[PDB]
C-alpha cells in the first residue's frame, strides 16, 4: 500500500503515534516519507551486512524482525518481517514503538537524523486534521 499523506497521518494518530515517547506525528510522517515514500511494501537489502529493511518505516532484520535469512539477527519486535509488509500498519507501528523505547529514540533511523532532525516538519501534517 502506498499511503497518501493525510490518510497516513490519521492512521498513525489513530494508532497512538502522536507524542509516543515524546515523538510528534510530524516526525513519524517525515520518517515514513524519507524511508519509503509511505510504501508498506518497500524493501531494501543491505549487501554490506546481509540484513534487509522492511515496510513503511524500513525496519531492519538484524535487530527488530525475523526473516530467517539474516546472520546472527535477533527479533526485538517479536514479529515476522512479513508482518511489516502488510497494508495494515498496526504491526509496523507496534514495532516502530518498540524501536523508540530504546535509548536513541527516533534517532535509531539514520534517515530521520539526516532529513527530519532540527528541521521544520510541520508541512507533513498540515491540513490533515491531526
Curated annotation (Swiss-Prot):
Every C-type lysozyme domain range: 1-130
Alphabetical list of InterPro entries matching this protein: Glyco_hydro_22 (IPR001916), Glyco_hydro_22_CS (IPR019799), Glyco_hydro_22_lys (IPR000974), Lysozyme-like_dom_sf (IPR023346)
GO annotation, biological process: antimicrobial humoral response; defense response to bacterium; defense response to Gram-negative bacterium; defense response to Gram-positive bacterium; inflammatory response; killing of cells of another organism
Catalysed reactions, as listed in the record: Hydrolysis of (1->4)-beta-linkages between N-acetylmuramic acid and N-acetyl-D-glucosamine residues in a peptidoglycan and between N-acetyl-D-glucosamine residues in chitodextrins
PROSITE patterns, per database record: GLYCOSYL_HYDROL_F22_1 (PS00128), GLYCOSYL_HYDROL_F22_2 (PS51348)
GO molecular function, one term: lysozyme activity
Annotated SUPFAM superfamilies: Lysozyme-like
Keywords: Amyloid, Amyloidosis, Antimicrobial, Bacteriolytic enzyme, Disease variant, Disulfide bond, Glycosidase, Hydrolase, Secreted, Signal
Enzyme class: hydrolase
Primary role: Lysozymes have primarily a bacteriolytic function; those in tissues and body fluids are associated with the monocyte-macrophage system and enhance the activity of immunoagents.
Quaternary state and interactors: Monomer.
Note: Lysozyme C is capable of both hydrolysis and transglycosylation; it also shows a slight esterase activity. It acts rapidly on both peptide-substituted and unsubstituted peptidoglycan, and slowly on chitin oligosaccharides.
Descriptive protein name: Lysozyme C
Gene: LYZ
Amino acid at each position: 500500500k502506498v499511503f497518501e499523506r493525510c490518510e497516513l497521518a490519521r492512521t498513525l494518530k489513530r494508532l497512538g503515534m502522536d507524542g509516543y515517547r515524546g515523538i510528534s506525528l510530524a516526525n513519524w510522517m517525515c520518517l515514513a516519507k524519507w524511508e519509503s515514500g509511505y510504501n508498506t511494501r518497500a524493501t531494501n537489502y543491505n549487501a554490506g551486512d546481509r540484513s534487509t529493511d522492511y515496510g513503511i518505516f524500513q525496519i531492519n532484520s538484524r535487530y527488530w524482525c525475523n526473516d530467517g535469512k539474516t546472520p546472527g539477527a535477533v527479533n526485538a519486535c517479536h514479529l515476522s518481517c512479513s508482518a511489516l509488509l502488510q497494508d495494515n500498519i498496526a504491526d509496523a507501528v507496534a514495532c516502530a514503538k518498540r524501536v523508540v523505547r530504546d535509548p536513541q529514540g527516533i534517532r535509531a533511523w539514520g534517515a530521520w537524523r539526516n532529513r527530519c532532525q532540527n528541521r521544520d516538519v510541520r508541512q507533513y501534517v498540515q491540513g490533515c486534521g491531526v
